[PDB]
Amino acid sequence: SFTVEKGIYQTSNFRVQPTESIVRFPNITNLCPFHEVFNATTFASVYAWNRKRISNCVADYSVIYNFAPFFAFKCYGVSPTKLNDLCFTNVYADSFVIRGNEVSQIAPGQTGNIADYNYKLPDDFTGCVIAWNSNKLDSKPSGNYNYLYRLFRKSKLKPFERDISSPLQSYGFRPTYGVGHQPYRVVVLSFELLHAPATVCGPKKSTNLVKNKCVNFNFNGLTGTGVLTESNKKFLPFQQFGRDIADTTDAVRDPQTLEILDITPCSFGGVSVITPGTNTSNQVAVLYQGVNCTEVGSNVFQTRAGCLIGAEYVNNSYECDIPIGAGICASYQQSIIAYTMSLGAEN
Amino acid sequence: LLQYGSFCTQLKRALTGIAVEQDKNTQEVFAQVKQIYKTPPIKYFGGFNFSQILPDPSKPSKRSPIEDLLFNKVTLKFNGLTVLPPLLTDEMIAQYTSALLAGTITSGWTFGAGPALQIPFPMQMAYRFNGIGVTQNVLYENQKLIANQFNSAIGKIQDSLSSTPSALGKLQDVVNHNAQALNTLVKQLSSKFGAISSVLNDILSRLDPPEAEVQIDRLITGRLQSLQTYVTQQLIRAAEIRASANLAATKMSECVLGQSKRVDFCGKGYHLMS
Amino acid sequence: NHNAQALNTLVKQLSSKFGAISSVLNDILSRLDPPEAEVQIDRLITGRLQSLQTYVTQQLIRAAEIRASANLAATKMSECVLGQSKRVDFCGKGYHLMS
Amino acid sequence: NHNAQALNTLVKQLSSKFGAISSVLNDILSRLDPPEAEVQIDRLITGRL
Amino acid sequence: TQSYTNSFTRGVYYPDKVFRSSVLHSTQDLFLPFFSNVTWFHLPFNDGVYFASTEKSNIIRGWIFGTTLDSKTQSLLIVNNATNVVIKVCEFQFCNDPFLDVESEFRVYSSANNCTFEYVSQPFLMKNLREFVFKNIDGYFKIYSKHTPINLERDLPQGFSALEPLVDLPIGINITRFQTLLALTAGAAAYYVGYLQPRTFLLKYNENGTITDAVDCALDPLSETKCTLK
Numbered sequence: 001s002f003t004v005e006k007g008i009y010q011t012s013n014f015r016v017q018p019t020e021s022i023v024r025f026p027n028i029t030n031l032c033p034f035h036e037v038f039n040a041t042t043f044a045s046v047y048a049w050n051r052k053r054i055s056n057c058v059a060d061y062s063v064i065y066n067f068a069p070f071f072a073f074k075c076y077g078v079s080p081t082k083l084n085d086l087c088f089t090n091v092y093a094d095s096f097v098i099r100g101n102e103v104s105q106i107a108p109g110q111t112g113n114i115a116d117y118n119y120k121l122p123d124d125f126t127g128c129v130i131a132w133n134s135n136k137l138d139s140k141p142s143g144n145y146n147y148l149y150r151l152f153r154k155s156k157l158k159p160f161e162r163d164i165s166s167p168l169q170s171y172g173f174r175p176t177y178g179v180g181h182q183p184y185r186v187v188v189l190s191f192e193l194l195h196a197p198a199t200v201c202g203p204k205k206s207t208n209l210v211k212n213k214c215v216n217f218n219f220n221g222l223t224g225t226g227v228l229t230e231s232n233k234k235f236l237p238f239q240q241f242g243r244d245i246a247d248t249t250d251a252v253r254d255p256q257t258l259e260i261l262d263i264t265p266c267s268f269g270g271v272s273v274i275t276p277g278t279n280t281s282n283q284v285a286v287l288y289q290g291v292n293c294t295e296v297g298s299n300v301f302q303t304r305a306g307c308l309i310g311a312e313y314v315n316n317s318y319e320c321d322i323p324i325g326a327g328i329c330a331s332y333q334q335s336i337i338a339y340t341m342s343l344g345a346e347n
Numbered sequence: 348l349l350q351y352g353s354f355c356t357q358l359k360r361a362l363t364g365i366a367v368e369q370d371k372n373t374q375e376v377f378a379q380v381k382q383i384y385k386t387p388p389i390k391y392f393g394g395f396n397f398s399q400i401l402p403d404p405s406k407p408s409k410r411s412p413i414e415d416l417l418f419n420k421v422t423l424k425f426n427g428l429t430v431l432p433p434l435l436t437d438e439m440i441a442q443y444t445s446a447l448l449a450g451t452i453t454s455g456w457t458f459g460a461g462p463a464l465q466i467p468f469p470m471q472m473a474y475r476f477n478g479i480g481v482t483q484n485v486l487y488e489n490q491k492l493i494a495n496q497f498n499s500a501i502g503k504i505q506d507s508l509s510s511t512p513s514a515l516g517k518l519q520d521v522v523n524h525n526a527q528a529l530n531t532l533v534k535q536l537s538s539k540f541g542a543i544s545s546v547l548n549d550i551l552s553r554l555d556p557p558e559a560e561v562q563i564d565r566l567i568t569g570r571l572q573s574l575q576t577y578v579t580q581q582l583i584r585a586a587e588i589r590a591s592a593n594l595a596a597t598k599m600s601e602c603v604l605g606q607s608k609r610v611d612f613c614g615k616g617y618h619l620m621s
Numbered sequence: 622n623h624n625a626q627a628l629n630t631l632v633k634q635l636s637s638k639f640g641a642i643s644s645v646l647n648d649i650l651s652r653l654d655p656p657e658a659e660v661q662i663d664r665l666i667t668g669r670l671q672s673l674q675t676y677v678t679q680q681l682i683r684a685a686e687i688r689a690s691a692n693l694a695a696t697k698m699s700e701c702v703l704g705q706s707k708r709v710d711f712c713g714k715g716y717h718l719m720s
Numbered sequence: 721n722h723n724a725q726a727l728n729t730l731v732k733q734l735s736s737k738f739g740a741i742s743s744v745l746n747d748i749l750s751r752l753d754p755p756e757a758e759v760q761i762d763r764l765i766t767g768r769l
Numbered sequence: 770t771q772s773y774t775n776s777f778t779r780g781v782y783y784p785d786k787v788f789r790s791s792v793l794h795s796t797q798d799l800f801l802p803f804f805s806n807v808t809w810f811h812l813p814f815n816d817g818v819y820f821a822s823t824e825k826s827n828i829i830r831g832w833i834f835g836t837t838l839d840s841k842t843q844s845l846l847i848v849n850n851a852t853n854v855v856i857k858v859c860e861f862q863f864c865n866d867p868f869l870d871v872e873s874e875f876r877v878y879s880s881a882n883n884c885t886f887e888y889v890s891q892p893f894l895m896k897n898l899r900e901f902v903f904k905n906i907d908g909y910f911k912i913y914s915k916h917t918p919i920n921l922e923r924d925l926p927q928g929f930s931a932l933e934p935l936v937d938l939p940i941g942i943n944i945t946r947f948q949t950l951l952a953l954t955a956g957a958a959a960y961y962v963g964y965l966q967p968r969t970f971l972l973k974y975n976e977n978g979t980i981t982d983a984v985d986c987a988l989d990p991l992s993e994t995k996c997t998l999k
């Protein structure tokens with residue numbers, strides 16, 4: 001509306017903006033054994049799939065694109081382009097060779113011979129599926145029969161189950177064989193989240209300590225913003241985080257030096273505007289609810305309800321006109337004044 | 348969230364109305380008189396104590412001993428949740444109560460219908476006895492006995508209040524209910540609602556913008572439902588609180604500013620004063 | 622004022638999309654095939670059902686208070702107009718005579 | 721009358737589909753795959769809630 | 770020689786590595802049920818094993834784990850001595866009755882073979898009572914320990930104590946059975962064995978952040994009421 005009557009209205013809010021950024025990637029740099037995973041010239045059968053554990057190293061994935069123009073490059077729980085910014089607990093790499101037409105059979109909640117008899121993939125999978133052709137490397141002119149796959153089994157396989165017990169059928173790979181039958185090299189990576197402090201993460205670099213100010217922080221993947229302050233909490237020598245009744249982060253230890261640092265949110269609150277009728281005047285006053293006057297008309301008054309800006313505190317008493325807070329009212333006497341409400345006449 | 352509509356305006360309007368009504372309840376109940384009366388310096392009223400209920404000047408907060416006991420016995424920055432202070436402080440309410448007590452002691456029921464008219468306390472008690480069907484000579488010939496009985500009855504009240512541990516359950520239920528509702532609302536923020544995670548920052552820092560919408564909308568719907576439930580519960584409770592405040596205001600008008608004849612309205616027996 | 626505001630909000634809620642391609646049923650029907658229309662229709666249906674439920678709940682809550690006020694007014698009419706009352710401050714300030 | 725009507729309506733509401741394949745959990749679970757069963761169950765759960 | 774006794778309120782550890790204080794937390798994991806049989810010896814692994822001992826002469830040192838106990842399968846052989854600790858997963862050939870000669874390992878196993886894991890650090894060991902909790906979950910081997918003085922008693926002491934995590938071995942192999950390891954001349958030893966079960970607990974943290982009390986939500990109706998009321 002274009003006209004505002006006498007009263008107090010709550011319009012919007014406010015918040016203190018961040019100053020700078022802080023990163024704490026600890027110190028250690030290594031190289032993951034990704035070279036040995038690929039170009040090994042020896043890939044096992046699907047029925048006996050390789051399983052490797054990768055940890056305590058810095059994972060680099062540009063080499064994955066540098067390797068070959070992969071026929072398949074798919075990620076399910078994570079966006080493929082963002083794998084260079086995540087920190088993981090451990091990585092499980094499964095390498096084997098399967099037919100080109102059966103590449104689509106490697107998916108959660110999928111049915112197939114290899115799906116239920118060779119490699120059962122759970123519904124809650126978190127990882128990527130990558131496959132590329134290997135016709136020029138694993139196709140003998142007379143037929144490479146070293147690859148075998150199970151065909152008959154009484155019961156379906158469990159997630160991440162390997163059996164080593166004629167059900168087995170030998171694969172036949174020839175260069176004359178067309179698309180859909182040439183051997184493809186498939187690598188399946190499994191990811192773990194929300195576990196022991198992640199270690200496979202090193203692509204970026206760190207910063208230093210700042211305190212008593214609203215600054216973004218990223219402590220080994222713990223994103224957020226707030227104020228870092230010294231803490232008097234007796235951490236046992238093995239915790240890392242801290243919580244409270246609300247189940248939120250309130251403390252953390254620096255990876256470099258063992259020190260407990262409290263974390264508090266930056267200042268915020270509501271904003272209210274005190275004005276008389278627009279027919280009378282256009283002067284207004286602003287109240288910051290529940291905020292000390294230091295954080296924020298050239299006249300500043302502090303009340304229990306918050307910091308009042310633009311009103312002068314007189315020490316008289318009148319009947320209440322515009323309620324503000326705990327026994328404080330405002331009126332348009334010409335300027336805006338704040339006083340203490342009077343209960344009545346003495347008798 | 349902008350695509351959902353204007354639910355937030357409705358929630359804000361409901362909460363603001365609740366707060367204004369909460370202020371109005373106290374304003375209506377306690378601000379009955381327009382003059383601030385005072386008691387005489389000499390506290391002699393024909394043999395009656397009133398010290399257990401009159402304000403105590405020694406202590407800084409100026410409260411009666413019974414008010415002190417009640418104040419001590421009752422007992423008791425989030426994520427977008429704030430608590431506002433009441434318009435009237437405790438000292439102002441104490442001043443209202445003291446003015447009412449002084450008026451009813453020094454004037455009787457006359458100050459509740461016009462100018463306050465003085466009268467000796469035994470004569471007011473004789474009028475009140477006459478108002479229930481007993482003659483004045485019954486009071487005037489048993490002044491000391493009735494004064495002693497009144498003194499003992501007022502003395503036993505503090506012990507009766509202190510000994511019983513659940514005497515103030517009604518005033519504790521309000522605090523307990525508000526705390527439970529706020530705690531449930533805060534704790535609801537850790538639910539997944541069938542999403543990959545309950546943290547928006549993790550989803551934004553792990554997936555592409557084209558895909559994060561499917562996960563974000565579930566969280567939006569769940570939190571909107573939680574807020575709507577909280578607001579509805581608050582309105583339902585506020586209605587009952589308003590009804591109780593209206594009853595309290597009626598009782599203050601009828602039992603304190605006058606003598607009532609309604610049975611079991613201002614206590615059990617034949618009403619005299621309050 | 623409250624009735625007008627509630628009705629205006631209810632009629633204004635019809636223009637929301639609720640995460641759909643369009644807020645008009647005819648536009649979706651004339652542009653998309655029936656196998657695909659249901660996915661977009663469901664969101665609109667759910668949003669409008671929620672709006673109606675909210676409106677009905679608010680109306681019930683207001684009606685309860687209106688009924689309480691009407692009961693009070695009926696008692697006042699019976700006690701201050703058809704007779705003389707001795708209840709203090711029930712029928713005005715002072716000693717009641719008539720209404 | 722009101723109590724009986726409310727209870728009858730609440731019990732009767734269990735047979736609605738709410739935009740799903742069927743109104744029985746067993747037939748949805750057996751006939752469909754888990755990745756789609758976990759999607760079909762949500763509509764019924766939300767409606768009953 | 771077997772026997773039986775009462776577990777009392779023993780076998781509570783720290784579920785995770787998150788600091789808390791002056792709060793009540795509800796945890797769901799594998800724990801030792803209160804007031805249950807624990808066997809006294811003078812052995813299947815199941816879902817977990819609780820080990821407690823108070824022997825002083827250090828005849829007890831290390832344990833042996835395995836499924837078939839043969840060189841065809843990997844097997845944990847923890848060795849504790851006066852200076853360090855040896856952790857190996859290599860598929861050793863399991864002798865029928867392993868024991869330390871004191872220090873030839875021939876009687877423990879005949880040959881060493883293919884493997885990839887190795888860990889050497891301060892030994893686990895150090896009127897004294899020792900507790901150990903073993904569990905193999907999600908490709909990890911987790912071990913807890915705690916030391917506390919005890920008066921002369923034939924049974925478990927009355928009171929409460931918390932077990933702090935010691936090591937988290939990323940082994941992830943198949944375990945079905947286990948045996949104890951002794952160093953020796955005839956002799957005798959005393960120790961207790963308990964088994965873990967999936968339970969739900971209500972842990973209490975003090976202002977300094979250490980566990981001081983807990984309640985099992987499946988022992989009796991009073992405990993269920995306590996857990997529901999939190």
Ligand SMILES: *[C@@H]1O[C@H](CO)[C@@H](O[C@@H]2O[C@H](CO)[C@@H](O)[C@H](O)[C@H]2NC(C)=O)[C@H](O)[C@H]1NC(C)=O
Binds near residue numbers: 396398
């Ligand atoms: C009103 O009652 C009070 C309480 O019994 C009386 O004050 C007591 O007086 C005696 C004698 O001086 C003291 O020993 C007590 O300590 C007092 N009580 C308190 C709580 O301080 C008072 O005397 C009575 N009123 C009159 C007018 O006598």
Ligand SMILES: *[C@@H]1O[C@H](CO)[C@@H](O)[C@H](O)[C@H]1NC(C)=O
Binds near residue numbers: 292293294
């Ligand atoms: C506001 O900050 C000043 C700065 O020291 C402090 O003296 C004052 O007590 C603070 N006010 C409140 C209400 O905390």
Ligand SMILES: *[C@@H]1O[C@H](CO)[C@@H](O)[C@H](O)[C@H]1NC(C)=O
Binds near residue numbers: 313314315
């Ligand atoms: C108002 O009251 C008296 C005036 O004599 C003084 O002591 C007090 O400081 C005044 N308050 C002000 C000036 O803010």
Ligand SMILES: *[C@@H]1O[C@H](CO)[C@@H](O)[C@H](O)[C@H]1NC(C)=O
Binds near residue numbers: 774775805
């Ligand atoms: C332990 O087991 C024995 C038999 O094996 C049984 O009689 C007894 O009740 C169980 N519990 C205790 C505390 O002895």
Ligand SMILES: *[C@@H]1O[C@H](CO)[C@@H](O)[C@H](O)[C@H]1NC(C)=O
Binds near residue numbers: 853889
């Ligand atoms: C104790 O074990 C460590 C670890 O292998 C070994 O280095 C050390 O020599 C052993 N001590 C003795 C006395 O054999």
Ligand SMILES: *[C@@H]1O[C@H](CO)[C@@H](O)[C@H](O)[C@H]1NC(C)=O
Binds near residue numbers: 882883884
């Ligand atoms: C260990 O495993 C490898 C891998 O198959 C095998 O070549 C070797 O014979 C096995 N045994 C030993 C003692 O290395």
Ligand SMILES: *[C@@H]1O[C@H](CO)[C@@H](O)[C@H](O)[C@H]1NC(C)=O
Binds near residue numbers: 836
């Ligand atoms: C582990 O050992 C048990 C006992 O022999 C056996 O039944 C099982 O197949 C083995 N493997 C796994 C993965 O449990």
Ligand SMILES: *[C@@H]1O[C@H](CO)[C@@H](O)[C@H](O)[C@H]1NC(C)=O
Binds near residue numbers: 234976977979
């Ligand atoms: C925690 O610290 C406080 C103060 O230093 C102390 O009183 C208390 O006993 C400590 N808690 C322990 C040692 O369990």
